[model samples]
Target: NSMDMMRQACAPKFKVEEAELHGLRKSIFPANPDKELKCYAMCIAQMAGTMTKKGEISFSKTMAQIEAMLPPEMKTMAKEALTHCKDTQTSYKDPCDKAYFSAKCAADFTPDTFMFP
Candidate 1:
């Protein structure tokens, strides 16, 4: 069956190591505007678990990166939520927890509007 092939062919993403994570930590700081917001997040969050995954210097601090860009109202909601849940350490976190942070992260993902040529 295709299922068997799926199992055989499917692979987790190359099994990242702690060493890889350290690189990511250094990569995202200050700021870089070339990448799209969510795309940048995908790179790092995948490296870590979920809540704290981050990439690019601009988004150095995960929560702060996303937190800074949230719309006025959602920023408030994110602020309240952050008081309890700072960063997600697990992939299987609950929807409620996921939702809380996902929104917060998404809101925080603002690409740089101005960069030097």
Candidate 2:
């Protein structure tokens, strides 16, 4: 599954453990004290094609991914949350921080659409 693939691809790179990855499904915002978790989020975002290496998020790509990956019933809510959160990319300088916070924002807005590997 896509979530498993992301975990396999990102966890090793960020040295994130299975427990830490599982924790993301519950809370990703408090990653302020966890660099590895932030980088894990960054890796996932980059692999998902919603974020660039420079930490810039592509709203179009994000929306497209939502359309392609999310269930039809959740599409509208996901898009709405994306719109509210996408701009958070510019608020942070580090790619890890940018990715983590942007994801946190989206999750905060519509948690039902948020998922992690």
Candidate 3:
């Protein structure tokens, strides 16, 4: 009964740490935490959060360029996000990078993030 309805609404995208699941069983689901169930549920929740706050350019630079200067995790996350944004979806109507491909763009580059300087 409880298992069936919860399954339909939310689903897992990726499972992170197994250790976190064990911890949640103890803390959140004493009566019926359903660790297996919540793992996917948690992923969906995170996805929802991301969708709500998509593409927030906090710094005044290209993400790949400004990524390393950000928090360590964000560096990787930003890089991955850029790749996924480029690789996963089909593009139409506008350019992807939105920075380069213009005469006005400067030509500054680093090993990690490159910008026209």
RMSD of each: 15.5, 1.7, 16.0
lDDT of 1 by residue, 14-109 (tens): 343334333233332223322233233343343333334232122235447436554655655545544434344234243323423343333344
Better of 1 and 2 by lDDT: 2
Off by over 4 Å in 3: 1-63, 87-90, 95-117
For candidate 3, the TM-score is 0.24
Name the candidate that leads on TM-score. Answer: 2
lDDT per residue (tens digit) for residues 1-117 in model 3: 332333334433334344544333232322233444434433332332322133222222334343544456446644544544442212222221221111012111112222111
Q: Which lDDT tens digits does candidate 2 get at residues 58-113?
A: 88997888897888898999899988886787878888888788888887888756
lDDT of 3 at 23: 37
Number of clashing pairs per prediction, in order: 7, 0, 6
Poorest 10 consecutive residues by lDDT, candidate 1 = 108-117
Clash pairs for candidate 3: 12-40, 29-33, 106-116, 107-116, 108-116, 108-117
TM-score of each: 0.27, 0.88, 0.24
Steric clash pairs (candidate 1):
28-56, 28-57, 29-57, 31-58, 45-53, 51-88, 66-108
Worst-scoring 10-residue span by lDDT in model 3: 99-108
